[PDB]
Symmetry: D2
């Protein structure tokens, strides 16, 4: 729990997430995707439960990446919600929402949903 | 535009969202929920597209609130993903995910999904 | 109650849902979408809780529409999950998932999520 | 594509899905869960694209199970949306929504979301 969130994590697609978990609940770092109209690292900011469990529970957290950096602007943002589980093999299990900025007409189809599992391997 | 988003907003459940959009695409503020095992304000951080498109397209954004403050700890976090639409009645239309910390056993039922629409009142 | 649900319903996009709730918990009917690469009516099948609770609780249900008929084939399917609420203004509030068939490569972006509310007009 | 959907599939949790895919798009069978206020088989009905791909694509399908049978009535329903991929190892990849019948007050928290992968192993 706590500390263990800090580090470099990779998801199945090969995207890399580098985060720092602050003692009070903050999450900061950068994200490099393997898919999308992405190119390079993007800033990410989030929050986690800095006082999780004491039943054998994971630590809830979530973070956002707006897909705009100095090289690309996909006009979209992704949010990941999930929980961290530490152990010999620690992982972050998430479900995400990716919303693109659309005109009203296309608003009905602006959000994609998926899931990603991140490991430090 | 950072400004347009900056302000106080309320959603249909009666929750309060106080946000400041910064020049670099950052979002910070506090959230007061009308529902849940929540009590008082919680800190929120997010990001938005500071350079949207020059048409009548919304501005994509998202933010997170971990439901822990000095009064309560719900051991859960919510992320909202959606878009800001300006005009006379500016709105933020979102879809959210609420994940609770759980044992490996109940992980299958750790996440709730819903949608919220916010109406702006103040800057 | 099977009846309450049986009827013609429309959602905020202007789509039509014609459904019959059968005694065993089955749902069958046709759906006419106002959006997408859809054209005409499509067959729908679903299930609902034929024995809900005896309080002011909604009736959970869900249905699917594969977007293929004799005129079009969009290679995608949508499932709606939500609840039926009776009264004078009966509504079906739902959240939906629209999955498109894709190559392994773009599978990450195969599913869209949204919400729809239906208002009843006819039985 | 087509035919291959018919069979017994199992998901990570150990739930078993037995389906029959009809030549015209129908899906019928039963579902036995490993989790939830479940007990036994429940009927399921769905639809699939009976004319998928010809790029190497999966077959979109979806189905519903209302959690009521002769033994239990959880007053909930689950819908799975996803696509089928055949091959030496065929699988059905899904994201699901589980809605419980609530009073209005609790409507905001009536739906759970997750994902499941099914194999014939």
């Amino acid at each position: 729990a706590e500390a263990g969130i800090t580090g470099t994590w990779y998801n199945q697609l090969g995207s890399t997430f580098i985060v720092t978990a602050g003692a009070d609940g903050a999450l900061t770092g950068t994200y490099e995707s393997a898919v999308g109209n992405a190119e390079s690292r993007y800033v990410l900011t989030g929050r986690y439960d800095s006082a999780p469990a004491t039943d054998g529970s994971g630590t809830a957290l979530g973070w956002t990446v707006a897909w705009k950096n100095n090289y690309r602007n996909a006009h979209s943002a992704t949010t990941w919600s999930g929980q961290y589980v530490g152990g010999a093999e620690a992982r972050i299990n998430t479900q995400w929402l990716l919303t693109s900025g659309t005109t009203e007409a296309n608003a009905w189809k602006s959000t994609l949903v998926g899931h990603d599992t991140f490991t430090k391997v």
